[PDB]
Amino acid sequence: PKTYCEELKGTDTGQACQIQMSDPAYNINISLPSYYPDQKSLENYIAQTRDKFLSAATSSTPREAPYELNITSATYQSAIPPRGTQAVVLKVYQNAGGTHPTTTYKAFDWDQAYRKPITYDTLWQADTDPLPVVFPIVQGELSKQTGQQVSIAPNAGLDPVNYQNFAVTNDGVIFFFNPGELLPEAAGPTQVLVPRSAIDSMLA
């Protein structure tokens, strides 16, 4: 019931897998729920994520004192005749030394039926169009709320800021970016949901 994190210097907290280690000028605390297929994706990514953030503070960032990475993901799953798909969105925000403001939440899509994640080869399709697909309920409930559906701004609400990252479920693929008011630069990244039957075949 583990992945990288286990050997990644892992610490146990229960329904989490944690890697907390800090160097003489920075810090890393990162968590993975028991089973995230190829978390190797984030945690390979952290090698990538945090190095990039510390990567800048290796020169001149308001580093509180040294540097740190807080990161942790949640998985989701698609529903297709045989199983479906899996995507896990990490809470990873880090700052150089406390003070360099740096935040992002990252999720990824992996194939559920074949135990296989997808890459930019066929993960990005540049057949890329709007992502209001989560938005329907938000207004749809609104439609409950005022008996009608309104206008919600995408960085004002395209997608649940309750999410935070590329979270593709059987209902869609919610993609996140960090803007100003769908969870500002302080709350993390915004997100826009892409068509489930539409964008997957529209992957790559």
Tab-separated table of N, CA and C in Angstrom, residues 54-200:
chain	number	residue	atom	x	y	z
A	54	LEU	N	13.356	26.167	-4.904
A	54	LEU	CA	14.615	26.414	-4.217
A	54	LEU	C	15.575	26.890	-5.297
A	55	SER	N	15.244	26.443	-6.487
A	55	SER	CA	16.065	26.661	-7.640
A	55	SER	C	16.350	28.110	-7.950
A	56	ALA	N	15.276	28.904	-7.705
A	56	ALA	CA	15.352	30.358	-7.772
A	56	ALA	C	16.075	30.904	-6.512
A	57	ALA	N	15.622	30.541	-5.264
A	57	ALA	CA	16.250	30.950	-3.958
A	57	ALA	C	17.689	30.518	-3.856
A	58	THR	N	18.216	29.827	-4.814
A	58	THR	CA	19.633	29.582	-4.780
A	58	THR	C	20.360	30.911	-5.153
A	59	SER	N	19.579	32.000	-5.455
A	59	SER	CA	20.161	33.310	-5.863
A	59	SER	C	19.756	34.500	-4.946
A	60	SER	N	18.445	34.772	-4.853
A	60	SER	CA	17.973	35.958	-4.084
A	60	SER	C	16.477	35.980	-3.739
A	61	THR	N	15.892	35.001	-3.105
A	61	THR	CA	14.458	35.123	-2.816
A	61	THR	C	14.212	35.496	-1.343
A	62	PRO	N	13.069	36.169	-1.004
A	62	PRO	CA	12.739	36.488	0.400
A	62	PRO	C	12.652	35.144	1.056
A	63	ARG	N	13.747	34.517	1.399
A	63	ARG	CA	13.527	33.242	1.990
A	63	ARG	C	13.357	33.324	3.498
A	64	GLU	N	12.173	32.961	4.014
A	64	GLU	CA	11.903	33.255	5.437
A	64	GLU	C	13.173	33.204	6.191
A	65	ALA	N	13.869	32.075	6.123
A	65	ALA	CA	15.181	31.972	6.650
A	65	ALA	C	15.904	31.107	5.590
A	66	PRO	N	15.441	29.827	5.406
A	66	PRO	CA	15.955	28.839	4.427
A	66	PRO	C	14.897	28.477	3.376
A	67	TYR	N	14.344	27.289	3.336
A	67	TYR	CA	13.297	27.027	2.356
A	67	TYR	C	12.501	25.791	2.699
A	68	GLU	N	11.292	25.700	2.155
A	68	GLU	CA	10.403	24.605	2.511
A	68	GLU	C	9.416	24.239	1.409
A	69	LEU	N	8.966	22.991	1.463
A	69	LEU	CA	7.966	22.448	0.547
A	69	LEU	C	6.942	21.686	1.384
A	70	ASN	N	5.679	22.119	1.223
A	70	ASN	CA	4.520	21.448	1.804
A	70	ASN	C	3.814	20.817	0.605
A	71	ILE	N	3.655	19.496	0.585
A	71	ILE	CA	2.937	18.880	-0.541
A	71	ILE	C	2.120	17.619	-0.264
A	72	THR	N	0.857	17.551	-0.708
A	72	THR	CA	0.091	16.336	-0.440
A	72	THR	C	-1.103	16.000	-1.366
A	73	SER	N	-1.283	14.785	-1.917
A	73	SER	CA	-2.365	14.636	-2.938
A	73	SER	C	-3.505	13.727	-2.582
A	74	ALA	N	-4.637	13.946	-3.324
A	74	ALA	CA	-5.843	13.192	-3.055
A	74	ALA	C	-6.328	12.235	-4.162
A	75	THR	N	-6.408	10.920	-4.320
A	75	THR	CA	-6.818	10.467	-5.686
A	75	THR	C	-8.333	10.320	-5.948
A	76	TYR	N	-8.605	10.439	-7.269
A	76	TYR	CA	-9.935	10.347	-7.905
A	76	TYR	C	-9.930	9.223	-8.920
A	77	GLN	N	-11.103	8.861	-9.437
A	77	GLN	CA	-11.149	7.779	-10.404
A	77	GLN	C	-12.255	7.888	-11.463
A	78	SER	N	-11.989	7.440	-12.700
A	78	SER	CA	-12.945	7.566	-13.787
A	78	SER	C	-13.765	6.311	-13.728
A	79	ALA	N	-14.924	6.316	-14.365
A	79	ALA	CA	-15.720	5.109	-14.439
A	79	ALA	C	-15.981	4.740	-15.900
A	80	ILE	N	-15.310	3.694	-16.345
A	80	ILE	CA	-15.445	3.181	-17.708
A	80	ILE	C	-15.783	1.694	-17.661
A	81	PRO	N	-16.615	1.171	-18.600
A	81	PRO	CA	-16.943	-0.236	-18.620
A	81	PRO	C	-15.927	-0.961	-17.742
A	82	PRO	N	-14.751	-1.428	-18.222
A	82	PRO	CA	-13.797	-1.941	-17.266
A	82	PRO	C	-13.231	-0.729	-16.517
A	83	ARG	N	-13.315	-0.726	-15.189
A	83	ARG	CA	-12.811	0.395	-14.362
A	83	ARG	C	-12.843	1.707	-15.163
A	84	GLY	N	-11.916	2.626	-14.902
A	84	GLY	CA	-11.926	3.886	-15.624
A	84	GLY	C	-10.575	4.566	-15.665
A	85	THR	N	-10.395	5.601	-14.849
A	85	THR	CA	-9.110	6.324	-14.827
A	85	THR	C	-8.785	6.886	-13.439
A	86	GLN	N	-7.514	7.166	-13.161
A	86	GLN	CA	-7.132	7.674	-11.837
A	86	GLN	C	-6.347	8.978	-11.940
A	87	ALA	N	-6.689	9.960	-11.098
A	87	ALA	CA	-5.978	11.219	-11.112
A	87	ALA	C	-5.831	11.810	-9.722
A	88	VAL	N	-4.621	12.185	-9.327
A	88	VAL	CA	-4.423	12.634	-7.938
A	88	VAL	C	-3.862	14.029	-7.785
A	89	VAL	N	-4.590	14.892	-7.052
A	89	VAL	CA	-4.170	16.292	-6.971
A	89	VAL	C	-3.501	16.736	-5.668
A	90	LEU	N	-2.205	17.013	-5.769
A	90	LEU	CA	-1.402	17.363	-4.612
A	90	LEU	C	-1.503	18.845	-4.221
A	91	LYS	N	-1.410	18.993	-2.902
A	91	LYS	CA	-1.361	20.316	-2.282
A	91	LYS	C	0.084	20.590	-2.108
A	92	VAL	N	0.611	21.283	-3.099
A	92	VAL	CA	1.961	21.675	-3.066
A	92	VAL	C	2.214	23.070	-3.531
A	93	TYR	N	2.615	23.637	-2.421
A	93	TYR	CA	2.939	25.003	-2.200
A	93	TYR	C	4.211	25.059	-1.450
A	94	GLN	N	5.123	25.814	-1.939
A	94	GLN	CA	6.325	25.972	-1.229
A	94	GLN	C	6.868	27.343	-1.451
A	95	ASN	N	7.669	27.686	-0.497
A	95	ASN	CA	8.223	28.993	-0.401
A	95	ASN	C	9.656	28.923	-0.029
A	96	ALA	N	10.428	29.822	-0.538
A	96	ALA	CA	11.826	29.790	-0.212
A	96	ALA	C	12.093	30.541	1.072
A	97	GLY	N	12.347	29.710	2.100
A	97	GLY	CA	12.655	30.119	3.464
A	97	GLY	C	11.499	30.555	4.294
A	98	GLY	N	10.299	30.373	3.771
A	98	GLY	CA	9.026	30.760	4.421
A	98	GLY	C	8.416	31.857	3.560
A	99	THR	N	9.235	32.853	3.271
A	99	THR	CA	8.761	34.094	2.662
A	99	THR	C	8.583	34.153	1.149
A	100	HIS	N	9.451	33.568	0.326
A	100	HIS	CA	9.185	33.635	-1.114
A	100	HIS	C	7.856	32.909	-1.378
A	101	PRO	N	6.766	33.690	-1.673
A	101	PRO	CA	5.384	33.178	-1.879
A	101	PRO	C	5.224	32.106	-2.946
A	102	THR	N	5.432	30.806	-2.781
A	102	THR	CA	5.220	30.021	-3.994
A	102	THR	C	4.257	28.843	-3.918
A	103	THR	N	3.174	28.889	-4.705
A	103	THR	CA	2.139	27.892	-4.510
A	103	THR	C	1.511	27.248	-5.711
A	104	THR	N	1.381	25.954	-5.710
A	104	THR	CA	0.638	25.339	-6.773
A	104	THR	C	0.092	24.009	-6.377
A	105	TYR	N	-1.016	23.679	-6.958
A	105	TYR	CA	-1.609	22.419	-6.618
A	105	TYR	C	-1.580	21.458	-7.806
A	106	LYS	N	-0.955	20.276	-7.779
A	106	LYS	CA	-0.869	19.524	-9.036
A	106	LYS	C	-1.489	18.142	-9.004
A	107	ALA	N	-2.258	17.873	-10.043
A	107	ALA	CA	-2.912	16.598	-10.223
A	107	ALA	C	-2.512	16.000	-11.548
A	108	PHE	N	-2.692	14.705	-11.672
A	108	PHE	CA	-2.331	14.026	-12.910
A	108	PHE	C	-3.305	12.921	-13.252
A	109	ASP	N	-3.364	12.610	-14.547
A	109	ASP	CA	-4.231	11.565	-15.060
A	109	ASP	C	-3.423	10.329	-15.434
A	110	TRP	N	-3.881	9.186	-14.959
A	110	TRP	CA	-3.230	7.914	-15.224
A	110	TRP	C	-4.277	6.895	-15.644
A	111	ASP	N	-3.918	5.952	-16.511
A	111	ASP	CA	-4.907	4.995	-16.966
A	111	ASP	C	-5.208	3.985	-15.846
A	112	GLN	N	-6.500	3.850	-15.580
A	112	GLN	CA	-7.015	2.938	-14.556
A	112	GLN	C	-7.088	1.467	-14.953
A	113	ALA	N	-7.391	1.183	-16.216
A	113	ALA	CA	-7.560	-0.194	-16.656
A	113	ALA	C	-6.246	-0.900	-16.912
A	114	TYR	N	-5.246	-0.151	-17.338
A	114	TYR	CA	-3.965	-0.751	-17.645
A	114	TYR	C	-2.879	-0.383	-16.646
A	115	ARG	N	-3.196	0.353	-15.559
A	115	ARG	CA	-2.131	0.735	-14.622
A	115	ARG	C	-1.061	1.431	-15.448
A	116	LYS	N	-1.369	2.581	-16.047
A	116	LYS	CA	-0.394	3.293	-16.856
A	116	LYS	C	-0.721	4.794	-16.875
A	117	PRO	N	0.204	5.680	-16.461
A	117	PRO	CA	-0.033	7.135	-16.488
A	117	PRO	C	0.171	7.683	-17.891
A	118	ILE	N	-0.321	8.889	-18.218
A	118	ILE	CA	-0.099	9.432	-19.555
A	118	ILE	C	0.886	10.616	-19.522
A	119	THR	N	1.692	10.818	-20.558
A	119	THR	CA	2.650	11.940	-20.551
A	119	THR	C	2.265	13.034	-21.553
A	120	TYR	N	3.046	14.132	-21.585
A	120	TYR	CA	2.804	15.233	-22.545
A	120	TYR	C	2.804	14.618	-23.929
A	121	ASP	N	3.229	13.404	-24.170
A	121	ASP	CA	3.173	12.988	-25.563
A	121	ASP	C	1.704	12.978	-25.998
A	122	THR	N	0.908	12.353	-25.158
A	122	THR	CA	-0.520	12.186	-25.373
A	122	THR	C	-1.362	12.662	-24.215
A	123	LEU	N	-0.764	13.445	-23.341
A	123	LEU	CA	-1.515	14.020	-22.256
A	123	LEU	C	-2.117	15.388	-22.614
A	124	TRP	N	-1.265	16.194	-23.256
A	124	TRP	CA	-1.680	17.471	-23.838
A	124	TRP	C	-2.151	17.025	-25.190
A	125	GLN	N	-3.315	17.551	-25.520
A	125	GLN	CA	-3.792	17.630	-26.885
A	125	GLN	C	-3.768	19.136	-27.082
A	126	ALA	N	-3.424	19.717	-28.202
A	126	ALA	CA	-3.525	21.176	-28.376
A	126	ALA	C	-4.840	21.435	-29.138
A	127	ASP	N	-5.676	20.403	-29.061
A	127	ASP	CA	-7.075	20.367	-29.482
A	127	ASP	C	-7.826	20.914	-28.245
A	128	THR	N	-7.070	21.739	-27.506
A	128	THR	CA	-7.470	22.345	-26.238
A	128	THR	C	-8.451	23.511	-26.347
A	129	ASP	N	-9.613	23.321	-25.728
A	129	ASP	CA	-10.671	24.324	-25.708
A	129	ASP	C	-11.177	24.530	-24.273
A	130	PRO	N	-12.054	25.538	-24.047
A	130	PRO	CA	-12.613	25.857	-22.726
A	130	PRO	C	-12.779	24.640	-21.808
A	131	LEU	N	-12.974	24.897	-20.508
A	131	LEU	CA	-13.139	23.815	-19.536
A	131	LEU	C	-14.235	24.111	-18.470
A	132	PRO	N	-15.384	24.665	-18.913
A	132	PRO	CA	-16.594	24.979	-18.102
A	132	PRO	C	-17.325	23.736	-17.586
A	133	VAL	N	-16.820	22.542	-17.885
A	133	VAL	CA	-17.536	21.288	-17.574
A	133	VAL	C	-17.879	21.035	-16.096
A	134	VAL	N	-17.156	21.614	-15.154
A	134	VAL	CA	-17.497	21.433	-13.732
A	134	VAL	C	-18.533	22.484	-13.374
A	135	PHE	N	-18.294	23.626	-13.981
A	135	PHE	CA	-19.087	24.829	-13.865
A	135	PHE	C	-20.594	24.574	-13.914
A	136	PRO	N	-21.085	23.634	-14.745
A	136	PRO	CA	-22.517	23.422	-14.879
A	136	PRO	C	-23.236	23.218	-13.556
A	137	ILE	N	-22.721	22.338	-12.690
A	137	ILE	CA	-23.367	22.106	-11.405
A	137	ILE	C	-23.321	23.379	-10.586
A	138	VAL	N	-22.141	23.977	-10.529
A	138	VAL	CA	-21.951	25.150	-9.689
A	138	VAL	C	-23.100	26.136	-9.897
A	139	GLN	N	-23.372	26.401	-11.175
A	139	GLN	CA	-24.589	27.142	-11.565
A	139	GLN	C	-25.760	26.165	-11.403
A	140	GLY	N	-25.626	24.960	-11.900
A	140	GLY	CA	-26.746	24.019	-11.799
A	140	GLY	C	-27.344	24.033	-10.372
A	141	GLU	N	-26.502	23.939	-9.339
A	141	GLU	CA	-26.980	24.060	-7.954
A	141	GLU	C	-27.542	25.481	-7.798
A	142	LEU	N	-26.836	26.407	-8.465
A	142	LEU	CA	-27.280	27.805	-8.407
A	142	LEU	C	-28.753	27.701	-8.830
A	143	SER	N	-28.988	27.032	-9.962
A	143	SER	CA	-30.330	26.812	-10.516
A	143	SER	C	-31.293	26.257	-9.462
A	144	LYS	N	-30.692	25.583	-8.495
A	144	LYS	CA	-31.454	25.161	-7.323
A	144	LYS	C	-31.640	26.438	-6.472
A	145	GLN	N	-30.479	27.041	-6.220
A	145	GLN	CA	-30.349	28.180	-5.300
A	145	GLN	C	-31.306	29.360	-5.591
A	146	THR	N	-31.343	29.809	-6.850
A	146	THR	CA	-32.232	30.885	-7.330
A	146	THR	C	-33.171	30.241	-8.352
A	147	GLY	N	-33.350	28.932	-8.344
A	147	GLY	CA	-34.228	28.337	-9.351
A	147	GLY	C	-33.663	28.520	-10.773
A	148	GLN	N	-32.506	29.193	-10.818
A	148	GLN	CA	-31.824	29.528	-12.074
A	148	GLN	C	-30.304	29.461	-12.021
A	149	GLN	N	-29.691	29.462	-13.199
A	149	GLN	CA	-28.245	29.452	-13.318
A	149	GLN	C	-27.798	30.820	-13.810
A	150	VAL	N	-26.676	31.294	-13.288
A	150	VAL	CA	-26.266	32.670	-13.537
A	150	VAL	C	-25.115	32.924	-14.551
A	151	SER	N	-24.133	33.648	-14.008
A	151	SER	CA	-22.820	33.958	-14.556
A	151	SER	C	-22.002	33.748	-13.298
A	152	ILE	N	-20.961	32.972	-13.542
A	152	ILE	CA	-19.871	32.759	-12.624
A	152	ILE	C	-18.596	33.008	-13.435
A	153	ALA	N	-17.624	33.742	-12.922
A	153	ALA	CA	-16.402	33.954	-13.702
A	153	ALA	C	-15.492	32.745	-13.528
A	154	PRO	N	-14.713	32.356	-14.552
A	154	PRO	CA	-13.846	31.171	-14.441
A	154	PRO	C	-12.789	31.324	-13.348
A	155	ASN	N	-12.055	32.407	-13.326
A	155	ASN	CA	-11.128	32.677	-12.219
A	155	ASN	C	-11.976	33.199	-11.060
A	156	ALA	N	-13.255	33.396	-11.298
A	156	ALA	CA	-14.179	33.691	-10.198
A	156	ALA	C	-14.941	32.375	-9.933
A	157	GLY	N	-14.649	31.250	-10.614
A	157	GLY	CA	-15.393	30.038	-10.267
A	157	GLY	C	-15.574	28.973	-11.348
A	158	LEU	N	-14.798	28.992	-12.433
A	158	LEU	CA	-14.931	27.942	-13.463
A	158	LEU	C	-15.069	26.608	-12.769
A	159	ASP	N	-14.155	26.358	-11.871
A	159	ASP	CA	-14.118	25.099	-11.177
A	159	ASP	C	-13.899	25.200	-9.719
A	160	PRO	N	-14.315	24.166	-8.982
A	160	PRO	CA	-14.131	24.197	-7.577
A	160	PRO	C	-12.683	24.476	-7.233
A	161	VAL	N	-12.576	25.505	-6.476
A	161	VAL	CA	-11.384	25.910	-5.791
A	161	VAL	C	-11.349	24.990	-4.606
A	162	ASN	N	-12.438	24.245	-4.471
A	162	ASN	CA	-12.476	23.204	-3.483
A	162	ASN	C	-11.500	22.086	-3.937
A	163	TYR	N	-11.200	22.015	-5.271
A	163	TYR	CA	-10.274	21.005	-5.816
A	163	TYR	C	-8.804	21.444	-5.673
A	164	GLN	N	-8.315	22.197	-6.687
A	164	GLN	CA	-6.943	22.743	-6.764
A	164	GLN	C	-6.088	22.075	-7.855
A	165	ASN	N	-6.424	20.916	-8.429
A	165	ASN	CA	-5.540	20.431	-9.513
A	165	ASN	C	-6.166	19.469	-10.526
A	166	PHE	N	-5.477	19.382	-11.696
A	166	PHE	CA	-5.862	18.514	-12.828
A	166	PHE	C	-6.511	17.233	-12.325
A	167	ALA	N	-7.764	17.336	-11.912
A	167	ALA	CA	-8.455	16.203	-11.331
A	167	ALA	C	-9.490	15.525	-12.221
A	168	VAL	N	-9.065	14.634	-13.105
A	168	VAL	CA	-10.023	14.073	-14.050
A	168	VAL	C	-10.734	12.841	-13.506
A	169	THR	N	-12.038	13.053	-13.310
A	169	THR	CA	-12.971	12.045	-12.837
A	169	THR	C	-13.827	11.561	-13.996
A	170	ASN	N	-14.720	10.624	-13.722
A	170	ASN	CA	-15.610	10.114	-14.753
A	170	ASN	C	-16.475	11.232	-15.338
A	171	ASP	N	-16.560	12.368	-14.638
A	171	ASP	CA	-17.376	13.483	-15.114
A	171	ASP	C	-16.571	14.484	-15.943
A	172	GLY	N	-15.245	14.421	-15.857
A	172	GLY	CA	-14.425	15.353	-16.616
A	172	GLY	C	-12.959	15.331	-16.235
A	173	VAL	N	-12.267	16.429	-16.526
A	173	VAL	CA	-10.847	16.562	-16.237
A	173	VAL	C	-10.638	17.990	-15.835
A	174	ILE	N	-10.621	18.232	-14.545
A	174	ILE	CA	-10.487	19.588	-14.084
A	174	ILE	C	-9.035	20.006	-14.000
A	175	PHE	N	-8.687	21.006	-14.816
A	175	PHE	CA	-7.313	21.486	-14.915
A	175	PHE	C	-7.150	22.789	-14.163
A	176	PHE	N	-6.060	22.880	-13.423
A	176	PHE	CA	-5.797	24.066	-12.608
A	176	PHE	C	-4.594	24.910	-13.029
A	177	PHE	N	-4.794	26.215	-12.866
A	177	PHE	CA	-3.765	27.245	-13.059
A	177	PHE	C	-3.893	28.247	-11.909
A	178	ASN	N	-2.826	28.928	-11.479
A	178	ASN	CA	-2.963	29.861	-10.339
A	178	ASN	C	-3.073	31.364	-10.762
A	179	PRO	N	-4.319	31.961	-10.752
A	179	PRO	CA	-4.586	33.351	-11.168
A	179	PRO	C	-4.850	34.399	-10.041
A	180	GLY	N	-6.145	34.722	-9.711
A	180	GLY	CA	-6.397	35.780	-8.707
A	180	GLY	C	-7.588	35.631	-7.763
A	181	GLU	N	-8.633	34.902	-8.145
A	181	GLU	CA	-9.864	34.871	-7.337
A	181	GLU	C	-10.615	33.595	-7.598
A	182	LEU	N	-10.019	32.481	-7.867
A	182	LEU	CA	-10.780	31.253	-7.861
A	182	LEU	C	-9.893	30.404	-6.981
A	183	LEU	N	-9.307	31.182	-6.028
A	183	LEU	CA	-8.347	30.767	-5.023
A	183	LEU	C	-7.016	31.442	-5.401
A	184	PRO	N	-6.969	32.781	-5.212
A	184	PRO	CA	-5.837	33.645	-5.570
A	184	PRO	C	-4.450	33.050	-5.347
A	185	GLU	N	-3.435	33.853	-5.690
A	185	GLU	CA	-2.037	33.462	-5.520
A	185	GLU	C	-1.759	33.103	-4.068
A	186	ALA	N	-2.704	33.418	-3.187
A	186	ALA	CA	-2.553	33.084	-1.788
A	186	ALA	C	-3.226	31.751	-1.516
A	187	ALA	N	-4.314	31.472	-2.240
A	187	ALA	CA	-5.045	30.230	-2.018
A	187	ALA	C	-4.524	29.083	-2.882
A	188	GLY	N	-3.725	29.419	-3.894
A	188	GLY	CA	-3.182	28.406	-4.785
A	188	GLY	C	-3.605	28.633	-6.230
A	189	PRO	N	-3.904	27.555	-6.993
A	189	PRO	CA	-4.318	27.645	-8.396
A	189	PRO	C	-5.838	27.550	-8.666
A	190	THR	N	-6.256	28.177	-9.771
A	190	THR	CA	-7.637	28.143	-10.287
A	190	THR	C	-7.729	26.877	-11.135
A	191	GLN	N	-8.950	26.509	-11.540
A	191	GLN	CA	-9.142	25.346	-12.405
A	191	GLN	C	-10.366	25.415	-13.270
A	192	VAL	N	-10.164	24.779	-14.416
A	192	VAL	CA	-11.126	24.709	-15.470
A	192	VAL	C	-11.326	23.281	-15.978
A	193	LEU	N	-12.523	22.737	-15.846
A	193	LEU	CA	-12.760	21.339	-16.150
A	193	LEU	C	-12.893	20.801	-17.569
A	194	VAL	N	-12.155	19.873	-18.157
A	194	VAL	CA	-12.359	19.636	-19.590
A	194	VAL	C	-13.222	18.415	-19.914
A	195	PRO	N	-13.948	18.467	-21.057
A	195	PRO	CA	-14.857	17.394	-21.485
A	195	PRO	C	-14.285	15.959	-21.381
A	196	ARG	N	-15.084	15.210	-20.654
A	196	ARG	CA	-14.752	13.832	-20.267
A	196	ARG	C	-14.645	12.803	-21.413
A	197	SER	N	-15.693	12.760	-22.238
A	197	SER	CA	-15.711	11.986	-23.494
A	197	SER	C	-15.055	12.851	-24.579
A	198	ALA	N	-15.091	14.155	-24.378
A	198	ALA	CA	-14.552	15.026	-25.417
A	198	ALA	C	-13.039	15.177	-25.335
A	199	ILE	N	-12.499	15.599	-24.197
A	199	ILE	CA	-11.067	15.851	-24.149
A	199	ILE	C	-10.194	14.624	-23.976
A	200	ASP	N	-10.684	13.506	-23.438
A	200	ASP	CA	-9.742	12.392	-23.305
A	200	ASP	C	-9.305	11.913	-24.690
